[PDB]
Amino acid sequence: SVGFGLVYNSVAEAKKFEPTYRLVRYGLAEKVEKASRQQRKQKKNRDKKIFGTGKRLAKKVARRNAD
Amino acid sequence: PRAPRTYSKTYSTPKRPYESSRLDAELKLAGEFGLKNKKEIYRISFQLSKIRRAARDLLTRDEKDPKRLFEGNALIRRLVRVGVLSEDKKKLDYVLALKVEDFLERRLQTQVYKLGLAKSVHHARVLITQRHIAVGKQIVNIPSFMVRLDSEKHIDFAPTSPFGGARPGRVARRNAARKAEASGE
Amino acid sequence: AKVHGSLARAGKVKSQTPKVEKTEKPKKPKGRAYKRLLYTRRFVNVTLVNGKRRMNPGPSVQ
Amino acid sequence: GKGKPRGLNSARKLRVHRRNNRWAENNYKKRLLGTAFKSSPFGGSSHAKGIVLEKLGIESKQPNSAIRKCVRVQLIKNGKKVTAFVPNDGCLNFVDENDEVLLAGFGRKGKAKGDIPGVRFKVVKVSGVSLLALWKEKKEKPRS
RNA sequence: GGACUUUUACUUUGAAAAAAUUAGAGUGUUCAAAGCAGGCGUAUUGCUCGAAUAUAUUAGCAUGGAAUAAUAGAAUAGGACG
RNA sequence: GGAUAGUGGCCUACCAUGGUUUCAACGGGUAACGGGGAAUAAGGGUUCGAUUCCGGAGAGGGAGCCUGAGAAACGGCUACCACAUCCAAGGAAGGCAGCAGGCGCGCAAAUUACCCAAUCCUAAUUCAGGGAGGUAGUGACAAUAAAUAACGAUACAGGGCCCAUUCGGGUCUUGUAAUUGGAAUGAGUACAAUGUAAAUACCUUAACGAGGAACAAUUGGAGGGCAAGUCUGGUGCCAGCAGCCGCGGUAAUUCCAGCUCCAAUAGCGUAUAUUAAAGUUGUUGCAGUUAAAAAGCUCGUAGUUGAACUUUGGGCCCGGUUGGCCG
Ligand SMILES: [Mg+2]
Ligand SMILES: [Mg+2]
Ligand SMILES: [Mg+2]
Ligand SMILES: [Mg+2]
Ligand SMILES: [Mg+2]
Ligand SMILES: [Mg+2]
Ligand SMILES: [Mg+2]
Ligand SMILES: [Mg+2]
Ligand SMILES: [Mg+2]
Ligand SMILES: [Mg+2]
Ligand SMILES: [Mg+2]
Ligand SMILES: [Mg+2]
Ligand SMILES: [Mg+2]
Ligand SMILES: [Mg+2]
Ligand SMILES: [Mg+2]
Ligand SMILES: [Mg+2]
Ligand SMILES: [Mg+2]
Ligand SMILES: [Mg+2]
Ligand SMILES: [Mg+2]
Ligand SMILES: [Mg+2]
Ligand SMILES: [Mg+2]
Ligand SMILES: [Mg+2]
Ligand SMILES: [Mg+2]
Ligand SMILES: [Mg+2]
Ligand SMILES: [Mg+2]
Ligand SMILES: [Mg+2]
Ligand SMILES: [Mg+2]
Ligand SMILES: [Mg+2]
Ligand SMILES: [Mg+2]
Ligand SMILES: [Mg+2]
Ligand SMILES: [Mg+2]
Ligand SMILES: [Mg+2]
Ligand SMILES: [Mg+2]
Ligand SMILES: [Mg+2]
Ligand SMILES: [Mg+2]
Ligand SMILES: [Mg+2]
Ligand SMILES: [Mg+2]
Numbered sequence: 071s072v073g074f075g076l077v078y079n080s081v082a083e084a085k086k087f088e089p090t091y092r093l094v095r096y097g098l099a100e101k102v103e104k105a106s107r108q109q110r111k112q113k114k115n116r117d118k119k120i121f122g123t124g125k126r127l128a129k130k131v132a133r134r135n136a137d
Numbered sequence: 138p139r140a141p142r143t144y145s146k147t148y149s150t151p152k153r154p155y156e157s158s159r160l161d162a163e164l165k166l167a168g169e170f171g172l173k174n175k176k177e178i179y180r181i182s183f184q185l186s187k188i189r190r191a192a193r194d195l196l197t198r199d200e201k202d203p204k205r206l207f208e209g210n211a212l213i214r215r216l217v218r219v220g221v222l223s224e225d226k227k228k229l230d231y232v233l234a235l236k237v238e239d240f241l242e243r244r245l246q247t248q249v250y251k252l253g254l255a256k257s258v259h260h261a262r263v264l265i266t267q268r269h270i271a272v273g274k275q276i277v278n279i280p281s282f283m284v285r286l287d288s289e290k291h292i293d294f295a296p297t298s299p300f301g302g303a304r305p306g307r308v309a310r311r312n313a314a315r316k317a318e319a320s321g322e
Numbered sequence: 323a324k325v326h327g328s329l330a331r332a333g334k335v336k337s338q339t340p341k342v343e344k345t346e347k348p349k350k351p352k353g354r355a356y357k358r359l360l361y362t363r364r365f366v367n368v369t370l371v372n373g374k375r376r377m378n379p380g381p382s383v384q
Numbered sequence: 385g386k387g388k389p390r391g392l393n394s395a396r397k398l399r400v401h402r403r404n405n406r407w408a409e410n411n412y413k414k415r416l417l418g419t420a421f422k423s424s425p426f427g428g429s430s431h432a433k434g435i436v437l438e439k440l441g442i443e444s445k446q447p448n449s450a451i452r453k454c455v456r457v458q459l460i461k462n463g464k465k466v467t468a469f470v471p472n473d474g475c476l477n478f479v480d481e482n483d484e485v486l487l488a489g490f491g492r493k494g495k496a497k498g499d500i501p502g503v504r505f506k507v508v509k510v511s512g513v514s515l516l517a518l519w520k521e522k523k524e525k526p527r528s
Numbered sequence: 529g530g531a532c533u534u535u536u537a538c539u540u541u542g543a544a545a546a547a548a549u550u551a552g553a554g555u556g557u558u559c560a561a562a563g564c565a566g567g568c569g570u571a572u573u574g575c576u577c578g579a580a581u582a583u584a585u586u587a588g589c590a591u592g593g594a595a596u597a598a599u600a601g602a603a604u605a606g607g608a609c610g
Numbered sequence: 611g612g613a614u615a616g617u618g619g620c621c622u623a624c625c626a627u628g629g630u631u632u633c634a635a636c637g638g639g640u641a642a643c644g645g646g647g648a649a650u651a652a653g654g655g656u657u658c659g660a661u662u663c664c665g666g667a668g669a670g671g672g673a674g675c676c677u678g679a680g681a682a683a684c685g686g687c688u689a690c691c692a693c694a695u696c697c698a699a700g701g702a703a704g705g706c707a708g709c710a711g712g713c714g715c716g717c718a719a720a721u722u723a724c725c726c727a728a729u730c731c732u733a734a735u736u737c738a739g740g741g742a743g744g745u746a747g748u749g750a751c752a753a754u755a756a757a758u759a760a761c762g763a764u765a766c767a768g769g770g771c772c773c774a775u776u777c778g779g780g781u782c783u784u785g786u787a788a789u790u791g792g793a794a795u796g797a798g799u800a801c802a803a804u805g806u807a808a809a810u811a812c813c814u815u816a817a818c819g820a821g822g823a824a825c826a827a828u829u830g831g832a833g834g835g836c837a838a839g840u841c842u843g844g845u846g847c848c849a850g851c852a853g854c855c856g857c858g859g860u861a862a863u864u865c866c867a868g869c870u871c872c873a874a875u876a877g878c879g880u881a882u883a884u885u886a887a888a889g890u891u892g893u894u895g896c897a898g899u900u901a902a903a904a905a906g907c908u909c910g911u912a913g914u915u916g917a918a919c920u921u922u923g924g925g926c927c928c929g930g931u932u933g934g935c936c937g
Contacts, residue, residue, distance in 0.1 A: 168361025279559040327441035333474020334849035378871035380841030430882035
């Protein structure tokens with residue numbers, strides 16, 4: 071078999087310099103659990119609609135139904 | 138919008154489809170080299186045509202012509218390193234009269250026949266396409282390998298495969314077990 | 323010319339040839355094995371002749 | 385002499401006199417005038433598809449003698465009416481009225497083939513299945 | 529010593545030029561289509577060849593040639609040279 | 611002069627009557643984006659190029675403009691034209707020739723999947739974003755490699771060169787099997803590792819995986835052109851076949867089939883187009899008395915073409931290249 075190899079001067083300058091997927095291959099980094107590109111994007115877009123905090127806007131909303 | 142991964146085709150078919158002459162000659166080459174189909178003859182028949190043209194052209198240049206020399210010797214040089222062009226037909230005039238079998242001769246398959254190993258070009262095939270051969274450390278299962286000069290004396294059975302050490306196959310090993318669990322105990 | 327001629331016997335002969343099933347037979351070798359067969363068979367053993375040699379002669383002259 | 389000019393600067397005439405005469409060349413003219421798109425029942429397209437109007441029994445030209453079994457088709461793409469040969473034995477029992485079929489040409493360059501007059505197209509499919517398959521019982525005509 | 533064709537055509541040789549494709553050299557992708565890689569060694573901190581070349585027949589530019597074919601010039605001398 | 615970033619009839623004012631054309635202007639067609647390029651291989655040519663790169667253009671049709679360095683921008687706005695969605699009937703909103711997907715059209719073209727790991731772009735910016743791109747999916751578009759069996763044993767025929775008087779017979783190697791023998795291998799399937807962003811496949815590899823109803827290859831053809839049946843059964847100018855010639859009316863080598871045989875074979879056939887064959891577009895390179903074709907005749911303009919002659923001969927220098935001979 072033939073591959074490719076690296077040996078970093080100190081563990082530190084690896085963790086810095088290595089791509090973060092090989093990091094997790096070794097355990098040297100956590101497998102971040104995220105929402106799929108679609109869920110992400112779709113959230114980005116739902117947000118696109120709102121101007122400001124919106125923590126304001128839900129006051130606008132909540133006002134209308136409590137009377 | 139990538140880059141066109143290029144390709145070309147390796148064969149050509151005959152203009153007259155039913156020359157029983159050519160059809161006869163072809164079949165001889167099929168059984169006297171243990172071939173699969175016509176395309177295996179076609180391929181080389183194409184191959185050969187491109188060589189003779191290349192030659193043909195250079196032969197129309199002047200001798201001592203820069204181009205003729207670099208690429209006339211080059212042609213010959215390749216045709217020698219393979220077993221097609223003999224040690225002193227090393228001219229361009231001889232590469233023209235270069236015949237077909239001249240190539241087909243140097244097949245791994247025909248070569249495996251040409252030194253023990255097989256006793257039959259058909260045995261030779263089913264041996265090659267089954268990891269039962271190695272050029273150097275390299276296992277090679279293509280019947281059309283084209284064996285080179287300095288490569289010739291390195292075609293031996295594999296480091297794996299029963300015919301070369303390391304285990305028997307699994308049909309032998311299947312038998313050693315059926316003479317075992319039954320008659321044994 | 324005439325264009326509405328009879329259609330009543332469409333399929334005449336096909337529907338009236340007696341069906342007969344194909345006999346079984348040992349499989350014929352496919353691939354390189356076949357051209358082997360064909361080679362050694364057509365010219366190496368050399369069978370029937372006439373001064374021209376014959377592929378498919380029905381029950382000879384005799 | 386040779387009846388054509390030779391002059392070093394006669395390119396003009398030669399260039400032109402040939403262009404002027406490519407026209408007696410049929411295939412060229414057909415190609416240039418777009419006949420294929422204009423007259424022709426198909427678009428020019430290798431194949432067309434239409435609906436079967438009636439079964440026709442066309443009688444063969446001499447010296448032969450038979451009923452050649454054809455179909456009248458309403459080509460879907462331009463509603464041109466064109467009659468088509470159903471090949472093989474009793475395959476006319478495979479196509480019906482209002483049936484939608486695929487027609488193709490006869491290999492004869494738009495000329496008619498053999499002893500069948502006015503027919504220049506063959507029926508290759510009917511109701512989306514092949515004809516050959518229907519005939520060799522590899523498939524069934526879908527249950528209209 | 530530079531500049532120099534009356535005015536052209538023609539022809540030579542170059543320049544400025546894209547890559548991919550084409551032709552074509554190198555290279556054992558296990559063969560091949562391909563790819564443009566790769567190769568050597570103490571393989572415990574290395575060394576090392578490459579990634580060429582041909583092709584464009586229009587026109588333009590530069591240049592060697594002046595055969596062929598056109599073209600200009602002294603005839604009321606309103607000619608040429610100094 | 612005005613306008614422009616700026617030249618310019620770009621626009622205006624005034625002034626002239628000019629500009630293009632048989633060396634084809636102008637107008638028409640184009641099932642026309644231009645080129646790099648593709649197919650076809652004696653050559654010369656013929657045909658194609660929506661489409662991986664360059665350039666142009668457009669974003670349902672048109673016009674208009676804002677912002678900005680840059681847009682006459684459309685995942686910007688304004689209007690008309692054409693479509694057309696939501697609605698509490700007052701009103702509001704959309705522009706897939708981006709990616710997927712749907713309808714329609716048709717002979718004709720794939721998943722509403724994963725990801726920024728690579729390639730590279732953007733921004734305030736190593737970080738964010740990117741249906742650019744990459745990955746897998748569908749995928750017999752084309753292309754490459756090339757399994758579907760291999761080797762013995764036995765008994766006959768004998769290729770047996772012989773010995774040799776004869777069913778006598780040396781002895782390998784062809785040919786045949788309702789006769790046997792063990793070896794081999796991956797298609798698969800699958801611990802693992804590898805591969806990957808995560809997967810998947812390939813490469814590698816444990817445990818498995820070959821004896822016929824299997825791991826069973828097909829497509830077309832068998833009169834000529836053209837390779838291969840005058841064998842059998844069916845039909846009887848019917849059904850049907852046949853690019854073309856032709857086959858079929860009772861002994862069909864051409865239909866329907868069985869058997870066998872041929873050809874190409876993981877591919878083979880059909881249709882349309884095109885190229886070679888085509889010296890049947892002919893410059894190379896055709897034809898024209900009678901096969902298709904010399905205008906009834908002559909003049910004549912464009913066009914094509916157009917006698918000969920002007921430094922020829924002699925004499926030298928310089929450094930070059932494949933061959934004489936030889937080591
Ligand atoms: Mg006739
Ligand atoms: Mg050391
Ligand atoms: Mg010059
Ligand atoms: Mg200006
Ligand atoms: Mg002015
Ligand atoms: Mg006027
Ligand atoms: Mg027109
Ligand atoms: Mg167009
Ligand atoms: Mg075009
Ligand atoms: Mg284009
Ligand atoms: Mg063009
Ligand atoms: Mg179009
Ligand atoms: Mg635009
Ligand atoms: Mg649209
Ligand atoms: Mg901006
Ligand atoms: Mg716009
Ligand atoms: Mg859009
Ligand atoms: Mg845009
Ligand atoms: Mg889309
Ligand atoms: Mg849908
Ligand atoms: Mg269809
Ligand atoms: Mg398709
Ligand atoms: Mg990225
Ligand atoms: Mg990023
Ligand atoms: Mg930070
Ligand atoms: Mg199989
Ligand atoms: Mg088996
Ligand atoms: Mg068959
Ligand atoms: Mg038959
Ligand atoms: Mg034939
Ligand atoms: Mg024959
Ligand atoms: Mg019969
Ligand atoms: Mg010439
Ligand atoms: Mg002629
Ligand atoms: Mg005449
Ligand atoms: Mg006249
Ligand atoms: Mg002259």
